[PDB]
Structures are given as structure tokens and as C-alpha cells.
Amino acid sequence: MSYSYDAPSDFINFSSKRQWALEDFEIGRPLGKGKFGNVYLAREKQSKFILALKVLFKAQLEKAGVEHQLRREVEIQSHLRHPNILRLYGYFHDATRVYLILEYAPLGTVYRELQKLSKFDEQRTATYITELANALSYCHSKRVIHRDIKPENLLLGSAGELKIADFGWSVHAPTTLCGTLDYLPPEMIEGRMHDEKVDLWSLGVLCYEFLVGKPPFEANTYQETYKRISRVEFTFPDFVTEGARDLISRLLKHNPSQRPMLREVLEHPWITANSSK
Amino acid sequence: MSYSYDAPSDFINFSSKRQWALEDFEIGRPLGKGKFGNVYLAREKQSKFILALKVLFKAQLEKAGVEHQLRREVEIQSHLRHPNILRLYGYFHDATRVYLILEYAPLGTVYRELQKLSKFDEQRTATYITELANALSYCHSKRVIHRDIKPENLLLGSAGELKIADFGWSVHAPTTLCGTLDYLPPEMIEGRMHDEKVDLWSLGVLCYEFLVGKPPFEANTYQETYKRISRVEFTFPDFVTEGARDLISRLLKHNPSQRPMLREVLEHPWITANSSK
Ligand SMILES: *SC[C@H](NC(=O)Cc1ccc2c(c1)OCO2)C(=O)NCc1ccncc1
Ligand SMILES: *SC[C@H](NC(=O)Cc1ccc2c(c1)OCO2)C(=O)NCc1ccncc1
Ligand SMILES: Nc1ncnc2c1ncn2[C@@H]1O[C@H](COP(=O)(O)O)[C@@H](O)[C@H]1O
Ligand SMILES: Nc1ncnc2c1ncn2[C@@H]1O[C@H](COP(=O)(O)O)[C@@H](O)[C@H]1O
Ligand SMILES: [Mg+2]
Numbered sequence: 001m002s003y004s005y006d007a008p009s010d011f012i013n014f015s016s017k018r019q020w021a022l023e024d025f026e027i028g029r030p031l032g033k034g035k036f037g038n039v040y041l042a043r044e045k046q047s048k049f050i051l052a053l054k055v056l057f058k059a060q061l062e063k064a065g066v067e068h069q070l071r072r073e074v075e076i077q078s079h080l081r082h083p084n085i086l087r088l089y090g091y092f093h094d095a096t097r098v099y100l101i102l103e104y105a106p107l108g109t110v111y112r113e114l115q116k117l118s119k120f121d122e123q124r125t126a127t128y129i130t131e132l133a134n135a136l137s138y139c140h141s142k143r144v145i146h147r148d149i150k151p152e153n154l155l156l157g158s159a160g161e162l163k164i165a166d167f168g169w170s171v172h173a174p175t176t177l178c179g180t181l182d183y184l185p186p187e188m189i190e191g192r193m194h195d196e197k198v199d200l201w202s203l204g205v206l207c208y209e210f211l212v213g214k215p216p217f218e219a220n221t222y223q224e225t226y227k228r229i230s231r232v233e234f235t236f237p238d239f240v241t242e243g244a245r246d247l248i249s250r251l252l253k254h255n256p257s258q259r260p261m262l263r264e265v266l267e268h269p270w271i272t273a274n275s276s277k
Numbered sequence: 278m279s280y281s282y283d284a285p286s287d288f289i290n291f292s293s294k295r296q297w298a299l300e301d302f303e304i305g306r307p308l309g310k311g312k313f314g315n316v317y318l319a320r321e322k323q324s325k326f327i328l329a330l331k332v333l334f335k336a337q338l339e340k341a342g343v344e345h346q347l348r349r350e351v352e353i354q355s356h357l358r359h360p361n362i363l364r365l366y367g368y369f370h371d372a373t374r375v376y377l378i379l380e381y382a383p384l385g386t387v388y389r390e391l392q393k394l395s396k397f398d399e400q401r402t403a404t405y406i407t408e409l410a411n412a413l414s415y416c417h418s419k420r421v422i423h424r425d426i427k428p429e430n431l432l433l434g435s436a437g438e439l440k441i442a443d444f445g446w447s448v449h450a451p452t453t454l455c456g457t458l459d460y461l462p463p464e465m466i467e468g469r470m471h472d473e474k475v476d477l478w479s480l481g482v483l484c485y486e487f488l489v490g491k492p493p494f495e496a497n498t499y500q501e502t503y504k505r506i507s508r509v510e511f512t513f514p515d516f517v518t519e520g521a522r523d524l525i526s527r528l529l530k531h532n533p534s535q536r537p538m539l540r541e542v543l544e545h546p547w548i549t550a551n552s553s554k
């Protein structure tokens with residue numbers, strides 16, 4: 001397979017054209033194990049800049065048929081630059097391996113934070129939703145839809161700032177296709193999986209999970225969860241305040257066009273009453 | 278911008294390593310114009326084999342932001358090998374142009390055949406639907422969905438058989454994403470635009486257009502066409518027979534999961550009574 005991506009492979013001077021080489025990095029402890037290779041804490045040798053190096057094995061990527069997914073993830077993420085989006089500085093590859101040079105987020109995942117605290121107060125929740133909506137507003141200005149927002153894909157920086165990670169399901173949103181609607185089925189004309197409103201629903205699920213400690217459609221079988229999502233059937237515990245209910249209910253709409261714009265989330269009075277941000 | 282695709286660029290002995298070059302081809306008359314270049318009749322010089330050379334301009338592709346769409350089109354189509362799918366033998370590129378080396382379809386488009394005849398008899402129609410269903414069964418076996426089937430995209434081979442062309446909107450649709458439904462909106466769970474059933478609707482529209490000479494949701498505004506498609510509002514002129522009505526009505530279902538399998542189209546009693554294949 002071709003590992004020539006439309007993504008940077010140029011060496012970066014982190015203190016302030018040569019391409020990356022494995023010899024540029026002092027490889028330290030494993031940070032995590034992925035399906036195709038691990039993530040290591042690493043340092044670029046010249047600058048001593050601390051980063052995360054994700055090592056993936058080409059043989060394994062091709063056997064699984066996920067190499068074009070990796071290509072798209074790298075091409076998308078490496079062109080996003082925002083303080084609440086995990087940076088992908090570049091990539092390179094050698095005879096057997098692909099290497100992703102990533103921002104190191106030192107304080108783990110929001111998934112872990114929720115495990116530890118069970119639920120978040122309204123200030124932490126509103127701050128995190130502010131950070132996510134800012135990150136997603138930036139994505140949508142680049143016509144990028146993330147499509148896999150959930151707590152294990154939210155990493156924490158050293159000041160506790162949220163970092164959206166995992167662009168493996170993202171797409172670059174918007175011809176002769178639509179010039180002629182006559183031959184298109186309803187689902188091609190609507191194009192809902194390519195609508196930026198996908199990510200607004202996930203923001204509502206997160207806001208609920210942050211406050212309650214479980215997501216609103218949780219069930220012990222897939223079929224019951226899908227049923228409740230389809231009916232938008234969920235309930236609030238008594239302790240969820242009316243302002244929080246208003247925002248969450250606005251976001252969890254089956255019809256994506258009824259969901260709010262991200263600016264309306266950022267400007268919601270419950271968010272501005274409670275955010276540190 | 279990278280023009281390294283996971284698609285063949287090796288020289289082929291059409292009578293029966295070295296990469297393609299423009300000087301391998303004699304160029305003939307222009308076959309057609311597109312917004313990004315032109316298509317020419319061409320001939321590979323050693324074998325004298327007739328083909329089509331589609332020439333696209335890099336500057337126009339990159340300005341329009343469609344270069345990754347072309348990459349996907351070439352990657353998908355060059356790995357499909359079926360007598361009712363237009364072959365893409367390989368590609369190459371130079372400082373300004375991308376070249377696609379295509380099978381030449383000498384009898385033109387089904388679109389032009391409809392202009393000439395107005396409408397098709399049942400035997401011609403059923404034979405075309407069999408060829409199309411065969412091609413789509415092969416595609417779906419390769420986990421490819423075409424998503425833009427329409428008469429302009431159906432070319433005609435030397436024996437008058439259909440050749441599906443234009444894979445510009447196609448997707449290869451073979452997982453942590455669905456591991457948890459809890460954070461996915463309904464449109465991501467359902468994934469309708471990634472369902473192979475997309476192409477069964479268009480088969481129904483085509484069957485109608487072939488018999489009637491107008492597509493079933495035709496309207497004089499796009500908004501009205503969309504409303505008719507969304508509402509599945511269509512009717513038949515009186516000459517359309519009961520068997521054809523049954524097939525078309527079975528294909529044009531709003532819910533993709535209610536559309537038939539391709540085997541049911543190929544074995545439909547109207548199809549087998551009328552198809553020469
Ligand atoms: S074709 C009409 C058009 N819809 C889209 O562009 C959605 C779409 C389709 C195909 C894609 C894609 C996105 O990305 C990949 O391939 C449109 O006009 N949409 C707006 C609209 C929707 C519903 N009603 C009216 C207007
Ligand atoms: S996540 C459930 C799964 N749906 C999909 O895989 C659709 C999909 C999602 C994301 C994509 C994609 C396709 O292609 C590109 O990214 C599924 O099991 N669907 C079938 C199903 C739906 C509803 N209930 C039961 C089964
Ligand atoms: N850039 C990073 N900084 C810190 N930890 C990470 C980084 N990327 C991945 N991880 C962690 O390593 C584990 C495996 O990563 P992945 O294979 O990318 O899912 C995950 O649980 C992450 O929490
Ligand atoms: N492989 C081919 N064989 C014959 N005609 C073609 C071929 N490819 C494209 N054409 C014609 O050239 C015109 C423009 O092609 P396109 O740019 O693919 O839309 C269309 O009218 C097609 O009829
Ligand atoms: Mg590749």
C-alpha cells in the first residue's frame with residue numbers, strides 16, 4: 001500500500017526540507033497499547049520536546065484492511081490546529097511501520113475522570129462543553145465532522161484542558177451528484193451522516209453523562225439502546241437542574257436540523273452561568 | 278498534493294517494472310468534456326488496443342477541492358473486474374495532468390439511447406436491469422456501493438451491454454465506533470448512505486425511466502422533486518404492465534431495509550420472462 005499521505009512529514013524545530021527519521025526520537029515508556037501498535041512517550045532529540053509517538057505495523061494495518069482509514073485520519077487531524085484538539089504534528093514511515101507524532105496529553109481521559117468522580121458538577125460540565133463546542137466550531141469551519149465524540153476520545157492536557165482525539169471516523173463535509181435529484185434515494189439527498197449536526201447530538205449525550213454519570217440511552221442490550229435512541233426516550237434524575245435539562249433536550253433531537261448551532265450552545269444561559277470558560 | 282494512489286500504474290500488454298507514460302498512447306478525437314478536463318479516444322502503441330484516456334488538470338482538481346475524491350474513485354474502480362463495469366486499467370500523472378486509462382465503450386450512453394428512442398420495450402429494459410443487477414451484485418460482494426447510478430453513467434459496450442461508469446461518489450463499506458451505541462445519533466447508527474440498499478432504489482428509478490421515458494419523481498423544481506422522493510409519490514402510465522409495476526414498487530421503498538435483495542430482482546418473474554440474460 002502507498003504510505004504517501006497528504007499530511008506533513010517535515011522535521012519541525014520545536015524550540016521556535018528535512019523529513020522525520022526514527023533516529024530523531026528518544027523512545028521512552030509505553031503510554032498505551034493500540035490494536036495496531038503502541039503509543040510511547042518520546043522526546044525529539046534536538047529540542048528535547050516531549051511528545052507521544054504512535055507506532056503502527058504496516059503488515060497489521062493491511063491485513064485488517066484499515067490502511068485507508070489511517071490515511072484519512074492522519075490527513076484530517078494533521079491539518080487541525082486548535083488548543084482543544086489533540087495535535088498531530090506529522091507522520092513518517094519506514095519499511096515495516098507507520099509513525100504518528102502526537103501531542104502528549106498527560107492527564108489521561110475524561111472516561112477515567114468520570115470513573116473516579118462518578119459525576120461532574122455543573123461548573124466542570126459547562127466548562128468541558130464550552131471547550132468541546134469551541135473545538136467543534138473550529139472543526140466545522142474546516143468542514144470536518146468528528147462523528148465519534150465520547151469520553152474515551154477526550155484526553156486531558158496538563159492544565160486539565162480537554163483535547164479531542166481519535167479522528168478515525170471523521171469526514172470532510174461539503175456537483176453532478178445533486179444536479180439531478182431524480183435518481184437519488186431519500187437518504188442520499190438528505191446526507192445525514194455527512195451533516196455537521198451529527199456532532200451536536202453527541203454533545204447532548206456528553207452533557208447528560210457528565211451530570212448523571214451514565215449516558216441517557218444506556219441499556220443492557222444493543223437492541224434496547226437503539227430503540228431508545230430511535231424514540232429519543234430518556235428521563236432525567238431529579239437532581240439535574242432545569243437549565244441543564246433545557247440544553248440537553250435541545251441537543252437530543254432525532255431530526256438533525258432541529259438541533260441547535262454550536263454558537264447557541266456556547267451562548268446558552270446555563271453554560272455561561274456555570275462555565276469557568 | 279500527493280498523486281500516489283493505491284491503484285495500478287504498470288504498463289499492460291493488451292495483446293495478452295515499466296510504468297505508463299503519455300508517449301505509450303496515440304490520441305484520437307475528443308469523446309467528451311468535463312469540468313476538470315476531457316476524455317479522448319486513444320490507442321496503446323505496441324498492442325494497437327483502443328481505449329479511452331481521461332485527462333484531468335491538477336490545478337482544477339486542487340482548486341475545486343476534489344483531489345481526494347478522484348483518488349478514491351480511481352482506487353475503487355481500478356480494483357473492480359466485471360463485464361458490466363467499465364474497466365479502469367490504470368492511471369498515471371505528469372506535472373500538470375492526471376490520466377485515467379479506461380475501457381472504451383463504443384455505443385455511447387444509455388442517456389443518449391433514451392433521447393433517440395424516447396422509451397424502451399420490456400425486453401430491452403429487463404435485459405438492462407439484469408446486467409445492472411449483476412454488476413451491483415459483484416460490487417456489493419466487494420463491499421462497494423456505487424451511489425450515483427443514472428442513465429448518463431451507463432455506457433454501452435460493443436454488444437450493447439451496459440457498462441456502469443462514474444465511481445466518483447462510490448464508497449467501500451466493510452469496530453470501536455459501533456462497540457458502543459450510547460453516543461451515536463440515530464443517523465450514525467443507521468448509516469443509510471453507507472447501505473448497499475442505496476443502489477436498489479436507483480435500479481427502481483431506472484426501470485421506470487426505461488419503460489416510461491421520464492423518471493418517476495420528475496417535477497419542475499428541485500424542491501418538488503425532493504418532496505415527491507421523500508413521500509415516494511409516483512404513478513404509472515396505463516401501458517406499464519403488472520409485472521413491471523410490481524418490481525418497481527418493490528424497489529422504491531423509503532426505508533432502505535424494505536428494499537429487495539439483488540437476487541430477488543434477478544429472479545423476479547417479470548425479469549425472467551423478458552430478459553434475454
Ligand atoms: S444531493 C442534495 C444535497 N445533499 C447533499 O449534498 C448530501 C450529501 C450527499 C452525498 C454526499 C454527501 C453529502 O457527502 C458525500 O456524498 C442537498 O441539497 N442537501 C441540502 C438539502 C437536504 C435536504 N433537503 C433540502 C436540501
Ligand atoms: S454503529 C451500528 C452499525 N451501523 C453502521 O456501521 C453504520 C455506519 C456507521 C458509520 C460509518 C459507516 C456505517 O460507514 C462509514 O462510517 C450497525 O450495526 N448498523 C445496522 C444496524 C442499525 C440499527 N440497528 C441494528 C443494526
Ligand atoms: N497523544 C497521547 N497522549 C497521551 N496518551 C495517549 C495519546 N494517544 C493515545 N494515548 C493513550 O494510549 C491508549 C491507546 O491509544 P490509541 O491506540 O491511540 O487508542 C489510549 O487509552 C490513550 O489514552
Ligand atoms: N470510457 C469511455 N468510453 C466511451 N465514452 C466515454 C468514456 N468515458 C467517458 N465518455 C464520454 O465522455 C463524456 C464525458 O465524460 P466524463 O468526464 O466521465 O463525464 C461523456 O459524455 C461520456 O459519454
Ligand atoms: Mg494508502
Ligand SMILES: [Mg+2]
Binds near residue numbers: 278279280344348
Ligand atoms: Mg491525494
